[PDB]
Design a protein around this nucleic acid. Structure first.
Ligand SMILES: CN[C@@H]1[C@@H](O)[C@@H](O[C@@H]2[C@@H](O)[C@H](O[C@H]3O[C@H]([C@@H](C)O)[C@@H](O)[C@H](O)[C@H]3N)[C@@H](N)C[C@H]2N)OC[C@]1(C)O
Ligand SMILES: CN[C@@H]1[C@@H](O)[C@@H](O[C@@H]2[C@@H](O)[C@H](O[C@H]3O[C@H]([C@@H](C)O)[C@@H](O)[C@H](O)[C@H]3N)[C@@H](N)C[C@H]2N)OC[C@]1(C)O
Ligand SMILES: [Mg+2]
Ligand SMILES: [Mg+2]
Ligand SMILES: [Mg+2]
Ligand SMILES: [Mg+2]
Ligand SMILES: [Mg+2]
Ligand SMILES: [Mg+2]
Ligand SMILES: [Mg+2]
Ligand SMILES: [Mg+2]
Ligand SMILES: [Mg+2]
Ligand SMILES: [Mg+2]
Ligand SMILES: [Mg+2]
Ligand SMILES: [Mg+2]
Ligand SMILES: [Mg+2]
Ligand SMILES: [Mg+2]
Ligand SMILES: [Mg+2]
Ligand SMILES: [Mg+2]
Ligand SMILES: [Mg+2]
Ligand SMILES: [Mg+2]
Ligand SMILES: [Mg+2]
Ligand SMILES: [Mg+2]
Ligand SMILES: [Mg+2]
Ligand SMILES: [Mg+2]
Ligand SMILES: [Mg+2]
Ligand SMILES: [Mg+2]
Ligand SMILES: [Mg+2]
Ligand SMILES: [Mg+2]
Ligand SMILES: [Mg+2]
Ligand SMILES: [Mg+2]
Ligand SMILES: [Mg+2]
Ligand SMILES: [Mg+2]
Ligand SMILES: [Mg+2]
Ligand SMILES: [Mg+2]
Ligand SMILES: [Mg+2]
Ligand SMILES: [Mg+2]
Ligand SMILES: [Mg+2]
Ligand SMILES: [Mg+2]
Ligand SMILES: [Mg+2]
Ligand SMILES: [Mg+2]
Ligand SMILES: [Mg+2]
Ligand SMILES: [Mg+2]
Ligand SMILES: [Mg+2]
Ligand SMILES: [Mg+2]
Ligand SMILES: [Mg+2]
Ligand SMILES: [Mg+2]
Ligand SMILES: [Mg+2]
Ligand SMILES: [Mg+2]
Ligand SMILES: [Mg+2]
Ligand SMILES: [Mg+2]
Ligand SMILES: [Mg+2]
Ligand SMILES: [Mg+2]
Ligand SMILES: [Mg+2]
Ligand SMILES: [Mg+2]
Ligand SMILES: [Mg+2]
Ligand SMILES: [Mg+2]
Ligand SMILES: [Mg+2]
Ligand SMILES: [Mg+2]
Ligand SMILES: [Mg+2]
Ligand SMILES: [Mg+2]
Ligand SMILES: [Mg+2]
Ligand SMILES: [Mg+2]
Ligand SMILES: [Mg+2]
Ligand SMILES: [Mg+2]
Ligand SMILES: [Mg+2]
Ligand SMILES: [Mg+2]
Ligand SMILES: [Mg+2]
Ligand SMILES: [Mg+2]
Ligand SMILES: [Mg+2]
Ligand SMILES: [Mg+2]
Ligand SMILES: [Mg+2]
Ligand SMILES: [Mg+2]
Ligand SMILES: [Mg+2]
Ligand SMILES: [Mg+2]
Ligand SMILES: [Mg+2]
Ligand SMILES: [Mg+2]
Ligand SMILES: [Mg+2]
Ligand SMILES: [Mg+2]
Ligand SMILES: [Mg+2]
Ligand SMILES: [Mg+2]
Ligand SMILES: [Mg+2]
Ligand SMILES: [Mg+2]
Ligand SMILES: [Mg+2]
Ligand SMILES: [Mg+2]
Ligand SMILES: [Mg+2]
Ligand SMILES: [Mg+2]
Ligand SMILES: [Mg+2]
Ligand SMILES: [Mg+2]
Ligand SMILES: [Mg+2]
Ligand SMILES: [Mg+2]
Ligand SMILES: [Mg+2]
Ligand SMILES: [Mg+2]
Ligand SMILES: [Mg+2]
Ligand SMILES: [Mg+2]
Ligand SMILES: [Mg+2]
Ligand SMILES: [Mg+2]
Ligand SMILES: [Mg+2]
Ligand SMILES: [Mg+2]
Ligand SMILES: [Mg+2]
Ligand SMILES: [Mg+2]
Ligand SMILES: [Mg+2]
Ligand SMILES: [Mg+2]
Ligand SMILES: [Mg+2]
Ligand SMILES: [Mg+2]
Ligand SMILES: [Mg+2]
Ligand SMILES: [Mg+2]
Ligand SMILES: [Mg+2]
Ligand SMILES: [Mg+2]
Ligand SMILES: [Mg+2]
Ligand SMILES: [Mg+2]
Ligand SMILES: [Mg+2]
Ligand SMILES: [Mg+2]
Ligand SMILES: [Mg+2]
Ligand SMILES: [Mg+2]
Ligand SMILES: [Mg+2]
Ligand SMILES: [Mg+2]
Ligand SMILES: [Mg+2]
Ligand SMILES: [Mg+2]
Ligand SMILES: [Mg+2]
Ligand SMILES: [Mg+2]
Ligand SMILES: [Zn+2]
Lengths: 49, 84, 101, 60, 119
RNA sequence: UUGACCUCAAAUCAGGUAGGAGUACCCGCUGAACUUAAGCAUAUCAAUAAGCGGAGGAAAAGAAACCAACCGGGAUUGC
RNA sequence: AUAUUGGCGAGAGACCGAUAGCGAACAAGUACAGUGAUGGAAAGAUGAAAAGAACUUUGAAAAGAGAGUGAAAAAGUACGUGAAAUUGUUGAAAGGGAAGGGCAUUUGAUCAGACA
RNA sequence: GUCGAAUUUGGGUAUAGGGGCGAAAGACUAAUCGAACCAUCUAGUAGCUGGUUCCUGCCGAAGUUUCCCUCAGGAUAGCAG
RNA sequence: CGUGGAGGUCAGUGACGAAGCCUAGACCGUAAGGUCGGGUCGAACGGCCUCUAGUGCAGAUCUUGGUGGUAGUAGCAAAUAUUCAAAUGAGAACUUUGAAGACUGAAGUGGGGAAAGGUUCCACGUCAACAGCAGUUGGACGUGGGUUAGUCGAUCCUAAGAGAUGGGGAAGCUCCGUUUCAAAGGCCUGAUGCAGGCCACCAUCGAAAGGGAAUCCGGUUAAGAUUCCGGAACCUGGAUAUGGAUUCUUCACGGUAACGUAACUGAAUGUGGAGACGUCGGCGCGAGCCCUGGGAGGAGUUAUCUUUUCUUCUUAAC
RNA sequence: GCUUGUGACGGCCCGUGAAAAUCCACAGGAAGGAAUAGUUUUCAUGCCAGGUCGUACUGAUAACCGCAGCAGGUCUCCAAG
RNA sequence: AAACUUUCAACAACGGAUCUCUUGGUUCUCGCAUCGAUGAAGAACGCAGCGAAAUGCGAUACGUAAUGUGAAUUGCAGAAUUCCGUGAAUCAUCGAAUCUUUGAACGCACAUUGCGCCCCUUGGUAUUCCAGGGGGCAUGCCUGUUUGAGCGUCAUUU
C-alpha cells in the first residue's frame, strides 16, 4: 500500500532489470552471453524487501 | 500446528534494510544491524568468520579512491602537469 | 538447574510495577520554612482513587511561598478528610484530623 | 507533461517552465514513475494554448 | 566535431558561461528529437561538450584562487597537495635534520673520515 | 575605584589533531575446551583458538643495575 | 642482520589439469536458501574462417525432404572426441517354475597358420 | 468443550541459552527444547563398526604362557617370515 | 604387470592420420598385461635404461554425476453442475458472444482495506516453456501504457519503550544513568551591540488502528482519481486597505436575571476549560435501510384472473 | 422492525477504566490611546502563498507465508426479501 | 511360428566417460613500502544512440582535462567526425578536475529522501512570512585569541 520511498525505489531498480537479454548483445565479438541469467519474477523469487 | 498453519502468521519483518551495508539485516526493535553492527563505530567482524570477512573486505567494492594509490605511489606523488 | 521464579523476579522484566493509571507519587510538602517554624494552609480540592492502592488520595493545593502560583501536593487521605477542607501544616499548626505537624 | 529531475519540487519546476518555455503555469501536480523518474503535469494559464506551445518546442 | 579543450582556454569566462547555455539549449533540443527518432548519436558529442566547457570554467577559477593565495601559509585545503595522510604529517626536512647544539659541535669535531688500506 | 595573579570556563574564536579500514608479519590485554594421561581432578593440549587494545615497513629489542668465575668476556636481533 | 597465508610489483615449479586445481578457469562470493548470523552452487572446447545452410518443396508451426557451405554436417550454435549404465530398429540364436558358470564333443558361423 | 469473560484478537514494546519465559507439561523459546540457532576450536577422541584398489612364485601361523582397573584392548614369551 | 610426471637414449611414431573410443577378428604370456587388422577419429605420442609419486577399486548404508526395473503402473474421486448454437482459429469438452440449467445467498463465490507482495493492474502482440487433461484463454511470454492532493495518510505529538549528553563503572569491545551529585539555554520589547523584564522546560527516536487544522457533489480514463475536469467550499501561514463599529462619559450598549450581539484595546504572570477516555442494562431520539398508499413515466403477464408483477421518482460538503 | 449514532439515566468493581503536542477562555492592569480628530485585525469584504514521500492492483480454495496456482494459516468495515 | 524375453553385432538413441587442450588454481623465490576528516574500506542509487550483467564512471556519470602514440572504433547505426594533422581511439599514460545518496559520517534525525538554525544573493511591494541560488553549525583533546566566573587571592584607589 503506502510504502517507504527506499522500498519504492528498490522496487523501480527491480522492474527496470526484469527484461530479456538485449538481442544485439548476442552479435558482439567474443560475446559469451546468451540469455539473461539473473532474471527474476514476482511469483518465483521474492526479493526480500 | 507448530508447522504450516502457524507459519501462516509470518507477516512482520524481523529486520529492515541496513543503511551502511544494505543487507536487510537491520533489526527493527533492536535498531542495529546483524552484519556490520551499524550503528556501531567500527564495522562488525570476527576471525571465525573468514568467509564473511572474505565476503566484505577491501576489494569487493569499487575501491573508488584507493585503486589509483598504487599508481600515485609509483610516480612520487606528482603535482602540476606534463608539458609537450 | 534452571533459574527459579524468585530469582527471575529481580532484574525485573515482566515483573516491574504497573505504573500507568497511577495518580503520581503520594508525598507531603517539602520541609521548608513554612512547616518547621510557622504553619501554612492548603485546601483539599479533590480526593480520588489510586489504581493499585486501596487508600484514596487527596489533591491538596497550597500557595507557593516564594512566587505567585499554586502548587499541588498528593496527600494520602486520612479517614474523614473531605473535598474543600482547609489543611494546616507545620510545627505551630493545630491538632485536627488531616493537618500535619 | 514533462519528465523532471527527482531533486526538483513544484517550485523549481514551475520556475523552469516559465523561463525556458516563456509560458504561465496555472498549477503543477508531480508524481514519481515506477521506473524512478518524476513526471510533471504542468497546466498552462488559459491565456496560452499548450497544443501550440508544444510543437513550438518541437514534439508532436 | 565540437568543443576542443585548448580552444576554450584562450576564451574568457563570461562567454564560456554563455557558450554553455548554448550547449544546454542545444542538448535540450536534441532530447526533444531523440524521442522522435530511432537513432540520435550526435547527442553524445554535445553532452561531452558540456563537460569540456565546465572543465575549463572550473579549471580557470581554480588556478585563479591558487595564485591569489600563493606564497603564504593557509591556502584552502583542496588546493593543497594530496600526498598521503601519513605523508601529510611526516616531520618536515627542516624539523628532521634539526640537530642539538651539543651534537652539531660533535659532527664538526669528528665527522666520518674517508680512509683506506693498502695490502 | 582600577590594575594584576591563580584556578576554572565559554566561542560556528585562530590553526590543528583523533576516530574507521586492513591485519600475513608485530607489541600488549584477555582467555578456553576438545585432546593426551589407555579412567581422572594436578599436569597436557597452551602461556594456543575465540574475544579486546595498539603500531610500522618492518615491530620489538638495544648501549648492561649483562654474562661470567676465565689469561676473562662486553648494546640488541637472527642462524 | 630478523619476521612476513596481507597490499603493490616481478621471475619460476619433476604441482593441478574442469568430480582435479582456490568454493569460483564462465555476468562467483554469482544464482539461491535462510528472520538472522550465516550458508553457498552448478557451469570451459562448432570451425582456419560463420562459410551459421540462399533457393525449392510438405507442413498452421515446430520441423521434415531436397539443395547448399565446409577438409569434415561421422562438426548444424542439442555443436571436438562421444566410453558405460541404459534404449529403438535391423540381423542371428536360444528359450516346459530365473539367468549366468566348469569339463567335453556335435552342429552353425567365422578365422589364423602352414604348404607350395 | 467454552462462548460477555482469568474472553478472543491486531500492532507497538520488554525478556535471549544454564538464559528467558511457564495458571507447572521439562512445557514454550522461528517444523529446533531434559539447554535454541550460527560459526570456529575441529580432520575433537574411539580398546568399537565399515571399507582398504594389479599378478604370480616360495615359506606359512595363532586362539596358549606371564603381568595389566586386564575380561571386545595392550605388553609379554611361543608359533611365522 | 600397469598409471601421472622427471633425467638419458632410439637423429623413435604421426595431418600420406598422433591419442582416444568401437570390434562373440588375429597373435604372444600361467597371469597382471602386450601386439595386430578393420571402424570411428582428429594433434600429438611411444620403446628402452633410470628417476619420482596424489600410481591400479566391485563393495566403505562411500562422494559427484548418469540410468533402469517397478511403469504407461499408484494415481489426476472434498468444495451439488453442467447443457445448446455461433464466432474465431490449422486445431474448441475447456477462449469469446448469444441462448438454457444452476451456485455462492449479503457471517458472499459481492463491494473496500491493514500486514505482505511489488507491476501482478491495463492494452496490444502471443503459445516454446508454465497453468500435474487441453489451450486459440492466463496471474504465462513480448512490447508498451499506466499511480496527478494546502484538505486522504505520512510529516507533528506523546504511550509502554528506546537513547545522546556533564558524568560513574569497565584492560577493552563497552556497562550504567535521562533527570543523571553539570557554569546546560532561550523568548519577546524596544531605547545592532546595548538598557531591560523575564521564562527558564537540558536532547532525541518511539503510533499509516491513540491525539490531531481543512472538501464536497457531478463528470471523466483501457488502466488514476475525496488527487483529474466543472462548480461549489474550508484551513493554515503571510500581506495590507475600504466600509462598518468605537470615542468629546475614551477602551459598546441592551436585559431585573440566566443571557444578548456584527464588532466592542491587553504585555507578562497566573489560572481555568475543552485534547481526555471502563463496561454492561433498559428507555428516548436522529440518520441509512426495510415495509407501504396516491399519482406521473418505462418494463412483464394476460385461454382464463389480477384498478396486477417489476422498476425511475434523487439532493454534497459549505 | 434492522443497523448505526447519540442523549438522559441505571448496574458494576480490594478493577473506577492513558499521556503529550495543540486551540480557547478567564483573572489580571503593564503599557498605549480622541476632538479638528484618534484608537480598533476575534464584525464584513478584499490580495499573495501551501512544499516533500505514498496513491496502480491483490488482499487470498491462484497476487501474503506454508518448497507450489498447497482442502492449511493471516487483522477489519459495509450487509436486502 | 510369431509376440515376448535374453545374448552378440551395426546403425540410431541416452548420457558426458576418455583423449587432447588451458588467459585458471597452486606452491617456491625475488623486489617494493602506499588507505583514511584533503571524507578511507563499504554501501545504495544512477550514467550508454541502442545493456539485463560483468567491468567502468558519477547529474562534466562505459566518462571531462592533461601527456604520449599516431589512425582507428566495430554487434548494427553513426559521425560541419578529420588523416603530411595540437590528430582517430573503449589505445596506452595520468601530474588536472568532477565525484549523486551515503558511510569512522559531523546541524537533528533516519522502518521518514522527515525536521531545524546562522551568513551572502535573487524574486514576490519586505531585516521579519514565502521561494529560488550559492555558503555554513558533530565530539574529545593540544597551542593561541577574545570574552568571562569565584572573599581562591595580591596590590590600589577616597
Ligand atoms: C540366450 N538367453 C537364454 C538362452 O541361453 C536359453 O537358455 C537356456 C535354457 O532355456 C535352458 O533350458 C532350461 O531353462 C529353461 C528356462 C526358461 O528357465 C527352463 O524352462 C527349462 O526347464 C530348462 N531345461 C537351460 N538349461 C540353459 C540355457 N542356455 O534360452 C533363452 C534364454 C533363457 O533367454
Ligand atoms: C563528599 N561526599 C559527598 C558524596 O558522598 C556524594 O553524596 C551523594 C549526594 O550528592 C546525593 O545528592 C544529590 O544527588 C541525588 C541523586 C541520587 O539523584 C539527588 O537526588 C539529590 O537531590 C542531590 N542533592 C545523594 N542523594 C546521594 C549521596 N551519596 O556527593 C556529594 C558529596 C558532598 O560530594
Ligand atoms: Mg573462444
Ligand atoms: Mg570463434
Ligand atoms: Mg522461498
Ligand atoms: Mg524468505
Ligand atoms: Mg521484507
Ligand atoms: Mg502473530
Ligand atoms: Mg521482534
Ligand atoms: Mg540475502
Ligand atoms: Mg565463515
Ligand atoms: Mg615527483
Ligand atoms: Mg515502572
Ligand atoms: Mg504527489
Ligand atoms: Mg510528490
Ligand atoms: Mg579548501
Ligand atoms: Mg601505513
Ligand atoms: Mg576555530
Ligand atoms: Mg585503530
Ligand atoms: Mg590470565
Ligand atoms: Mg587435536
Ligand atoms: Mg583422557
Ligand atoms: Mg581413551
Ligand atoms: Mg587472537
Ligand atoms: Mg628490511
Ligand atoms: Mg624500532
Ligand atoms: Mg649506560
Ligand atoms: Mg652479548
Ligand atoms: Mg603477487
Ligand atoms: Mg572444479
Ligand atoms: Mg567446485
Ligand atoms: Mg525453515
Ligand atoms: Mg580450446
Ligand atoms: Mg573457437
Ligand atoms: Mg534440411
Ligand atoms: Mg570429422
Ligand atoms: Mg555433406
Ligand atoms: Mg561420433
Ligand atoms: Mg567435429
Ligand atoms: Mg545428447
Ligand atoms: Mg558431436
Ligand atoms: Mg551400450
Ligand atoms: Mg510359465
Ligand atoms: Mg539355476
Ligand atoms: Mg518372469
Ligand atoms: Mg552348459
Ligand atoms: Mg447472550
Ligand atoms: Mg495482542
Ligand atoms: Mg485483530
Ligand atoms: Mg513491532
Ligand atoms: Mg541455570
Ligand atoms: Mg541475566
Ligand atoms: Mg518449536
Ligand atoms: Mg574393549
Ligand atoms: Mg568383534
Ligand atoms: Mg601426480
Ligand atoms: Mg562387446
Ligand atoms: Mg585406423
Ligand atoms: Mg587411430
Ligand atoms: Mg585440431
Ligand atoms: Mg589414490
Ligand atoms: Mg576408478
Ligand atoms: Mg563403481
Ligand atoms: Mg574388494
Ligand atoms: Mg528411480
Ligand atoms: Mg522413469
Ligand atoms: Mg501415458
Ligand atoms: Mg491411461
Ligand atoms: Mg491408471
Ligand atoms: Mg484419492
Ligand atoms: Mg470456419
Ligand atoms: Mg467444435
Ligand atoms: Mg471445463
Ligand atoms: Mg441458493
Ligand atoms: Mg476496489
Ligand atoms: Mg482492492
Ligand atoms: Mg492478451
Ligand atoms: Mg499441461
Ligand atoms: Mg501444453
Ligand atoms: Mg487480467
Ligand atoms: Mg505481461
Ligand atoms: Mg500534502
Ligand atoms: Mg514522534
Ligand atoms: Mg545509555
Ligand atoms: Mg554523558
Ligand atoms: Mg561520559
Ligand atoms: Mg493516526
Ligand atoms: Mg477529506
Ligand atoms: Mg492517467
Ligand atoms: Mg479502479
Ligand atoms: Mg450602535
Ligand atoms: Mg485513549
Ligand atoms: Mg385475459
Ligand atoms: Mg466539511
Ligand atoms: Mg455508568
Ligand atoms: Mg495562541
Ligand atoms: Mg488569545
Ligand atoms: Mg516601567
Ligand atoms: Mg490509488
Ligand atoms: Mg485504489
Ligand atoms: Mg487494490
Ligand atoms: Mg477482504
Ligand atoms: Mg474481499
Ligand atoms: Mg509463496
Ligand atoms: Mg520360437
Ligand atoms: Mg552410439
Ligand atoms: Mg584457455
Ligand atoms: Mg566522496
Ligand atoms: Mg561495456
Ligand atoms: Mg590527444
Ligand atoms: Mg584508458
Ligand atoms: Mg606511459
Ligand atoms: Mg558536477
Ligand atoms: Mg548523525
Ligand atoms: Mg522522498
Ligand atoms: Mg529518509
Ligand atoms: Mg527579501
Ligand atoms: Mg524561511
Ligand atoms: Mg569541529
Ligand atoms: Mg575539532
Ligand atoms: Zn549493516
Amino acid at each position: 500500500a503506502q510504502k517507504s520511498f527506499r522500498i519504492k525505489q528498490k522496487m523501480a531498480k527491480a522492474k527496470k532489470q526484469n527484461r530479456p537479454l538485449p538481442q544485439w548483445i548476442r552479435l558482439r565479438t567474443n560475446n559469451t552471453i546468451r540469455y539473461n541469467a539473473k532474471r527474476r519474477n514476482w511469483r518465483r523469487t521474492k526479493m526480500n524487501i | 500446528g507448530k508447522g504450516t498453519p502457524s507459519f501462516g502468521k509470518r507477516h512482520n519483518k524481523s529486520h529492515t534494510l541496513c543503511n551502511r551495508c544494505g543487507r536487510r539485516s537491520f533489526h527493527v526493535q533492536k535498531k542495529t544491524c546483524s552484519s556490520c553492527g551499524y550503528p556501531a563505530a567500527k564495522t562488525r567482524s570476527y576471525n571465525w568468520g573468514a568467509k564473511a570477512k572474505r565476503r566484505h573486505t577491501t576489494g569487493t567494492g569499487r575501491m573508488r579512491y584507493l585503486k589509483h594509490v598504487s599508481r600515485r605511489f609509483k610516480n612520487g606523488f606528482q603535482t602540476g602537469s606534463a608539458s609537450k | 538447574g534452571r533459574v527459579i521464579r524468585n530469582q527471575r523476579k529481580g532484574a525485573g522484566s515482566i515483573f516491574t510495577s504497573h505504573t500507568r493509571l497511577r495518580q503520581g507519587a503520594a508525598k507531603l510538602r517539602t520541609l521548608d520554612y513554612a512547616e518547621r517554624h510557622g504553619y501554612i494552609r492548603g485546601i483539599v480540592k479533590q480526593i480520588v482513587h489510586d489504581s493499585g492502592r486501596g487508600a484514596p488520595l487527596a489533591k491538596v493545593v497550597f500557595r507557593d511561598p516564594y512566587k505567585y502560583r499554586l502548587r499541588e501536593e498528593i496527600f494520602i487521605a486520612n479517614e474523614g478528610v473531605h473535598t474543600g477542607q482547609f489543611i494546616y501544616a507545620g510545627k505551630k499548626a493545630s491538632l485536627n484530623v488531616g493537618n500535619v505537624l | 507533461v514533462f519528465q523532471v529531475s527527482m531533486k526538483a519540487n513544484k517550485y523549481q519546476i514551475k520556475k523552469a517552465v516559465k523561463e525556458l518555455y516563456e509560458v504561465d503555469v496555472l498549477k503543477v501536480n508531480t508524481l514519481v514513475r515506477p521506473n524512478g523518474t518524476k513526471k510533471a503535469y504542468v497546466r498552462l494559464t488559459a491565456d496560452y494554448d499548450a497544443l501550440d506551445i508544444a510543437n513550438r518546442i518541437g514534439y508532436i | 566535431a565540437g568543443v576542443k579543450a585548448y580552444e576554450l582556454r584562450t576564451k574568457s569566462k563570461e562567454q564560456l558561461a554563455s557558450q554553455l547555455v548554448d550547449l544546454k539549449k542545444e542538448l535540450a533540443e536534441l532530447k526533444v528529437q531523440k524521442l522522435s527518432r530511432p537513432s540520435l548519436p550526435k547527442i553524445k558529442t554535445v553532452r561531452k561538450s558540456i563537460a569540456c566547457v565546465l572543465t575549463v570554467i572550473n579549471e580557470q577559477q581554480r588556478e585563479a584562487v591558487r595564485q591569489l593565495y600563493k606564497g603564504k601559509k593557509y591556502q584552502p585545503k583542496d588546493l593543497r597537495a594530496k600526498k598521503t595522510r601519513a605523508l601529510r604529517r611526516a616531520l618536515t626536512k627542516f624539523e628532521a635534520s634539526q640537530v642539538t647544539e651539543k651534537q652539531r659541535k660533535k659532527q664538526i669535531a669528528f665527522p666520518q673520515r674517508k680512509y683506506a688500506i693498502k695490502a
